[PDB]
């Protein structure tokens, strides 16, 4: 769950769909703060936007940018 | 796990991406306090930012500086 999330989130950053700031904020939040239920949301989004990294990035931002800041 | 983490953390210090203080604080925290789950986060970050030591350093600081101080 963690391994996979980190890899994808780096991939998005490297591909330019998320900025460095959000990646850093997000990984911190996911690693420590994010609750069991909140991890299930993230896992679920990742699986839904497989071939659509742009839509995934936009979704993670829309859902979690407030919580991670 | 420990051996590898220590080597990387020293490498970052010696390369100037982390200061001496944080290295010392971090090794203490990792050696003694850090929980099973917290070690998995560290291991995972290290593996993600191999070729980007600046980003690794910035990530470890963002995630762990509070816990190690």
Residue numbers in the entry:
A (entry chain A), B (entry chain B): 621 to 689
Authors' text:
The Arabidopsis VEL proteins are accessory proteins that interact with PRC2 to nucleate and propagate silencing at the FLOWERING LOCUS C (FLC) locus, enabling early flowering in spring. Here, we report that VEL proteins contain a domain related to an atypical four-helix bundle that engages in spontaneous concentration-dependent head-to-tail polymerization to assemble dynamic biomolecular condensates. The VEL domain adopts a compact globular fold, consisting of four α-helices in a quasi-antiparallel “up-down-up-down” configuration, each of which contributes to the hydrophobic core, as illustrated by VEL1VEL.
Noting that most crystal structures of SAM and DIX domains were determined with polymerization-defective mutants, we switched to this approach and thus succeeded in obtaining diffracting crystals of different mutants (including I664D, I575D, and RR>AD) under diverse conditions. We conclude that the VEL head and tail surfaces are defined largely by three key residues, an isoleucine (VIN3I575 or VEL1I664) and two basic residues (VIN3R554,R556 or VEL1R643,K645), that engage in close hydrophobic or electrostatic interactions, respectively, with partner residues from the apposing complementary surface. Indeed, VEL1VEL I664D crystals contain right-handed helical filaments composed of 12 protomers per turn that interact through their head and tail surfaces. Three of these filaments intertwine into a superhelical fiber whose width (∼79 Å) is similar to that of the WT VEL1VEL fibers observed by EM, suggesting correspondence between the superhelical fibers observed by these two methods. The same is true for VEL1 filaments, whereas the VIN3 filaments in the crystals are composed of dimeric VIN3VEL subunits. Clearly, VIN3VEL, but not VEL1VEL, has an intrinsic propensity to undergo domain swapping while forming assemblies during crystallization.
